[PDB]
Amino acid sequence: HHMRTLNKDEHNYIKQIANIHETLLSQVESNYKCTKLSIALRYEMICSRLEHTNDKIYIYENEGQLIAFIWGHFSNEKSMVNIELLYVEPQFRKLGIATQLKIALEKWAKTMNAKRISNT
Incomplete structure (x- = not known):
């Protein structure tokens, strides 16, 4: 249905995620600014x-639009998953989508024999 694995060939969605990720980092104002180059990289x-x-990136999509996503990375050194980014479009917050995305990522973490996903 709406929640699914993002594939590496989904370039538009990946560009959108890149732009949101860099923007959010920039917005904390810790000697880091997003740029066209940083977004491309x-x-x-x-x-x-x-x-x-x-x-693993799980997205929540509707009508060809990216509503939300979660991105997890498994560290072989740490044997656990870190959440790289979790984002829900403001308009669609408090509908349970972040919770659903976390649950999905945790199930993925278990298939990797990871101890857990990120704290927050």
């Missing part, structure tokens, strides 16, 4: 992550 970096086996 983030796009390549996410594509690279999705080519290997240590990362």
Whole structure:
């Protein structure tokens, strides 16, 4: 249905995620600013992550639009999953989508034999 695995060839969605990720980092104002270059590099970096086996992005989509997503990365050194990014479009908050996304990512973490997902 609406929640599904994001594939590495979904370039538009990956660009959108890259842009949101860089924006959110920039917004905390800790000697880090998003730029066109940082967004382009983030796009390549996410594509690279999705080519290997240590990362998972679950999206929530409707009518060809990205409503929400969660991105997890498994660290072989730490044997656990870190949540790289969890985002829900403001308009669609408090509908249970972040909770659903976390549950899905935790199930994925178990298939990797990961101790847990990120705290927050």
